[PDB]
Amino acid sequence: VSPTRMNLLQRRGQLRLAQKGVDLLKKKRDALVAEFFGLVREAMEARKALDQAAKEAYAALLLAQAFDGPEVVAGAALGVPPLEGVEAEVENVWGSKVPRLKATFPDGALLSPVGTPAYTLEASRAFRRYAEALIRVANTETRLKKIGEEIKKTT
Amino acid sequence: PGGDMSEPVTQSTLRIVGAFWRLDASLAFRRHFPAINWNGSYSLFTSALDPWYRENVAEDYPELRDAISELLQREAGLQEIVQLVGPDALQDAERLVIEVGRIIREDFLQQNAYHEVDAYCSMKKAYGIMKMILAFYKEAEAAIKRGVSIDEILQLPVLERIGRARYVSEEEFPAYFEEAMKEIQGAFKALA
Amino acid sequence: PGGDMSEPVTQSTLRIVGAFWRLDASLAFRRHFPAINWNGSYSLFTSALDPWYRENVAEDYPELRDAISELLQREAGLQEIVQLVGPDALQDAERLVIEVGRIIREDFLQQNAYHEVDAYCSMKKAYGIMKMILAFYKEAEAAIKRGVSIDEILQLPVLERIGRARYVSEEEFPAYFEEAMKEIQGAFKALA
Amino acid sequence: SLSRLMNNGVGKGKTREDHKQVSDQLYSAYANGVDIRKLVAIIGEDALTENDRRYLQFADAFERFFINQGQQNRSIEESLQIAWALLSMLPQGELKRISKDHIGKYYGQKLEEIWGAP
Amino acid sequence: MAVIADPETAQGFRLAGLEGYGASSAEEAQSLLETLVERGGYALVAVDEALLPDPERAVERLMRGRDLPVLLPIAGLKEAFQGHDVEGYMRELVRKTIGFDIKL
């Protein structure tokens, strides 16, 4: 690069631009840190809620095994179809696009939904609530991980 | 004389001239003539000539000129961030400003001195082109407020209509201006 | 002129002087005066003055000064972590040393020259202030390792004794120092 | 910009007693506003809090009314009234550079009268 | 969605509509999990911690290509009723993501 006074002025302008960019990126990293802390608190709360729902769902399932018997449960489980109300969507977070999961399993999708094996119906109820907590946990945790990788890129 | 603008001849000329049209080598490399450096140029005759423009060109012409200068300044401000993070990190409003600045640079400022029609441009033709660009920017900002993404906006056929308004002849121009304004109104009303 | 310490006059001056009290603008904006940068300053007269200190002030003055400088050094080693996460988010021991450093800065290092009593201070008063602060830090660290009252320490009545010694007279000082020492003992040993 | 001898000229018995604190508060608030203005272009307006938006709108209105005065002649009282009107956009108690006496005395005047003809 | 877990809860998974498999070793868990990755169908796999603590470490070479599959670790049936603090998992998660250990 040829040394001229105009080149010196341009280089000093470049230096000021670089310093201002460094400060701006630090501010962006601070904002990402605050969002990360909020999201990790939410994810912890969702995780413990999911744990409680899973415990009570397993308790109801074991009681349904004890009362209705394995054959009646298997006949109920054979009729009920697998998860068909599945929807996949994408969400933007700080310029990055992340996927989310959706479930919509109703009582109408069930086969012979009348709860004559009552404890089996209770197990289905608790498993539906378990699924709600599970999808909440999945979405919150994947958002948290993407925020973490964004912070790493900024650093 | 030697290399650059710090030589005493240019410095002595700077203090006794009312206008200063600085040229750029980087713009002339990529064949973007007339290659006037917009950031390092100025004029001092704007305010005195303002009464003449109101009578002989249009009543709102200085406001259009000020809006164009404001858009160019906004584009120049955002380019520092683009070097820092890249074009993907900008929000939709700033991306729209960047694209409109590119449109102004490619269409309005550029002028081919060896073309048969583009070599000369009257005042009212320039006023019409500025009016078209500002109307397009207003419509685009309104459509941004309605939730339209920027990528589908740039696919509109009215973009080619604006970009080739230079080569329209002087007497053919008013019909082209009317048709372009009608198309500008029509395109954005059906989008959202 | 440009803030460069590599300027010829400053660089020629630095090769022959025995002390160097570098100031900075950032401490001046925050109105912490004097604005001495304790990370960029240095002195080469400490070792020779050490015999005079223990012969006329106290036998434990140099070691107390070294401990104070070390505690100041530790706080600057944690700023990079604080630049990532908030000060309260850190461990209680690191929060303790950060609060001790903040107390040391804001109380000990401040002196106002536009004030009737904040512009002068003798040697013995400063030595007593350093002794009280160091004892408070040591006892608070002992209480943190004990495992109780990690935030009640930051509200003890010692905070009045520590901040009060900045305005104690030279004649009333030994009583204040003794009372502060016994207050520290009674507060740390017997509260929990 | 900077004036070294401003401290001697202002005070009591000359201009008005709230001059220095008002100048300090205006300086700090304008600096915060322009920093937030440069930050918005990356993170977007919705990522901000409420008070950063308050600072941003204060910075814009500060430029538009206080700086862009045109060919008008303003006395010192008019300038101080405009400055106090712009500080009223910030919430009371956020003004950390001013004593509470002057905040009780002067805060709360509407900007819109000046908006009619600034 | 699919879930790898103990055979006891597999019947409940089939009742609720979940695709459940019963297994007890890490080898068959990893092979079945990557088979579920390659096969067309639901993109979510849930893992009991007793067979594979980190399924991302199992599919780390398939994860480097595409990040659309979703994996989720959880306590097993035996670990569920005896229970534990999930905050240790949170500390491990934040220490993994930042590289820094804070907020116990």
PDB file of C-alpha atoms in Angstrom, chain D residues 42-118:
ATOM      1  CA  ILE D  42     -29.090  -4.870  14.773  1.00  0.00           C
ATOM      2  CA  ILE D  43     -31.316  -6.149  17.539  1.00  0.00           C
ATOM      3  CA  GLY D  44     -34.589  -4.521  16.463  1.00  0.00           C
ATOM      4  CA  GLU D  45     -37.014  -2.369  18.442  1.00  0.00           C
ATOM      5  CA  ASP D  46     -38.999  -5.206  20.032  1.00  0.00           C
ATOM      6  CA  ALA D  47     -35.875  -6.628  21.683  1.00  0.00           C
ATOM      7  CA  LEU D  48     -35.521  -3.414  23.689  1.00  0.00           C
ATOM      8  CA  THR D  49     -36.967  -2.643  27.084  1.00  0.00           C
ATOM      9  CA  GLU D  50     -39.333   0.254  27.697  1.00  0.00           C
ATOM     10  CA  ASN D  51     -36.710   2.663  29.040  1.00  0.00           C
ATOM     11  CA  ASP D  52     -34.324   2.189  26.119  1.00  0.00           C
ATOM     12  CA  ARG D  53     -37.221   3.082  23.832  1.00  0.00           C
ATOM     13  CA  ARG D  54     -37.801   6.139  26.028  1.00  0.00           C
ATOM     14  CA  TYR D  55     -34.154   7.126  25.558  1.00  0.00           C
ATOM     15  CA  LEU D  56     -34.384   6.586  21.792  1.00  0.00           C
ATOM     16  CA  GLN D  57     -37.490   8.732  21.388  1.00  0.00           C
ATOM     17  CA  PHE D  58     -35.944  11.369  23.657  1.00  0.00           C
ATOM     18  CA  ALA D  59     -32.848  11.475  21.455  1.00  0.00           C
ATOM     19  CA  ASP D  60     -34.910  11.903  18.291  1.00  0.00           C
ATOM     20  CA  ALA D  61     -37.124  14.621  19.777  1.00  0.00           C
ATOM     21  CA  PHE D  62     -34.055  16.292  21.296  1.00  0.00           C
ATOM     22  CA  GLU D  63     -32.442  16.598  17.875  1.00  0.00           C
ATOM     23  CA  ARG D  64     -35.636  17.680  16.104  1.00  0.00           C
ATOM     24  CA  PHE D  65     -36.704  20.380  18.557  1.00  0.00           C
ATOM     25  CA  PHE D  66     -33.666  21.460  20.574  1.00  0.00           C
ATOM     26  CA  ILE D  67     -31.000  21.430  17.871  1.00  0.00           C
ATOM     27  CA  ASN D  68     -32.966  22.265  14.707  1.00  0.00           C
ATOM     28  CA  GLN D  69     -34.069  25.769  15.640  1.00  0.00           C
ATOM     29  CA  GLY D  70     -33.646  27.481  12.272  1.00  0.00           C
ATOM     30  CA  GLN D  71     -33.593  31.272  12.067  1.00  0.00           C
ATOM     31  CA  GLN D  72     -35.247  31.858  15.446  1.00  0.00           C
ATOM     32  CA  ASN D  73     -33.932  33.857  18.398  1.00  0.00           C
ATOM     33  CA  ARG D  74     -34.354  32.130  21.762  1.00  0.00           C
ATOM     34  CA  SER D  75     -33.752  33.704  25.139  1.00  0.00           C
ATOM     35  CA  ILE D  76     -32.195  31.636  27.912  1.00  0.00           C
ATOM     36  CA  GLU D  77     -35.606  31.128  29.549  1.00  0.00           C
ATOM     37  CA  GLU D  78     -37.038  29.649  26.348  1.00  0.00           C
ATOM     38  CA  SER D  79     -34.038  27.341  25.981  1.00  0.00           C
ATOM     39  CA  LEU D  80     -34.364  26.135  29.573  1.00  0.00           C
ATOM     40  CA  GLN D  81     -38.116  25.615  29.146  1.00  0.00           C
ATOM     41  CA  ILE D  82     -37.534  23.489  26.039  1.00  0.00           C
ATOM     42  CA  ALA D  83     -34.822  21.529  27.858  1.00  0.00           C
ATOM     43  CA  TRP D  84     -37.122  20.859  30.812  1.00  0.00           C
ATOM     44  CA  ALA D  85     -39.920  19.846  28.442  1.00  0.00           C
ATOM     45  CA  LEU D  86     -37.631  17.305  26.783  1.00  0.00           C
ATOM     46  CA  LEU D  87     -36.478  15.938  30.148  1.00  0.00           C
ATOM     47  CA  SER D  88     -40.134  15.380  31.070  1.00  0.00           C
ATOM     48  CA  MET D  89     -40.223  12.617  28.450  1.00  0.00           C
ATOM     49  CA  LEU D  90     -37.911  10.655  30.743  1.00  0.00           C
ATOM     50  CA  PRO D  91     -39.599   9.351  33.915  1.00  0.00           C
ATOM     51  CA  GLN D  92     -39.099  11.236  37.166  1.00  0.00           C
ATOM     52  CA  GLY D  93     -36.380   9.749  39.331  1.00  0.00           C
ATOM     53  CA  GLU D  94     -34.431   8.532  36.308  1.00  0.00           C
ATOM     54  CA  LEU D  95     -32.864  12.018  36.298  1.00  0.00           C
ATOM     55  CA  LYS D  96     -29.968  11.033  38.554  1.00  0.00           C
ATOM     56  CA  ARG D  97     -27.893  14.149  37.801  1.00  0.00           C
ATOM     57  CA  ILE D  98     -30.382  16.695  39.202  1.00  0.00           C
ATOM     58  CA  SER D  99     -31.328  17.470  42.790  1.00  0.00           C
ATOM     59  CA  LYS D 100     -34.862  16.632  43.896  1.00  0.00           C
ATOM     60  CA  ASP D 101     -35.722  20.266  44.672  1.00  0.00           C
ATOM     61  CA  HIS D 102     -35.458  21.372  41.046  1.00  0.00           C
ATOM     62  CA  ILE D 103     -37.251  18.213  39.911  1.00  0.00           C
ATOM     63  CA  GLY D 104     -40.158  19.105  42.170  1.00  0.00           C
ATOM     64  CA  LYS D 105     -40.032  22.715  41.006  1.00  0.00           C
ATOM     65  CA  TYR D 106     -39.781  22.311  37.237  1.00  0.00           C
ATOM     66  CA  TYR D 107     -40.685  18.793  36.050  1.00  0.00           C
ATOM     67  CA  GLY D 108     -43.893  18.023  34.205  1.00  0.00           C
ATOM     68  CA  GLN D 109     -44.452  20.758  31.614  1.00  0.00           C
ATOM     69  CA  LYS D 110     -46.013  19.527  28.381  1.00  0.00           C
ATOM     70  CA  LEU D 111     -43.885  19.469  25.239  1.00  0.00           C
ATOM     71  CA  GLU D 112     -46.806  19.995  22.858  1.00  0.00           C
ATOM     72  CA  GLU D 113     -46.916  23.773  23.352  1.00  0.00           C
ATOM     73  CA  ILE D 114     -43.345  23.901  22.035  1.00  0.00           C
ATOM     74  CA  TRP D 115     -44.328  21.296  19.420  1.00  0.00           C
ATOM     75  CA  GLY D 116     -46.750  23.892  18.061  1.00  0.00           C
ATOM     76  CA  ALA D 117     -43.872  26.269  17.275  1.00  0.00           C
ATOM     77  CA  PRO D 118     -40.326  25.162  18.304  1.00  0.00           C
TER      78      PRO D 118
END
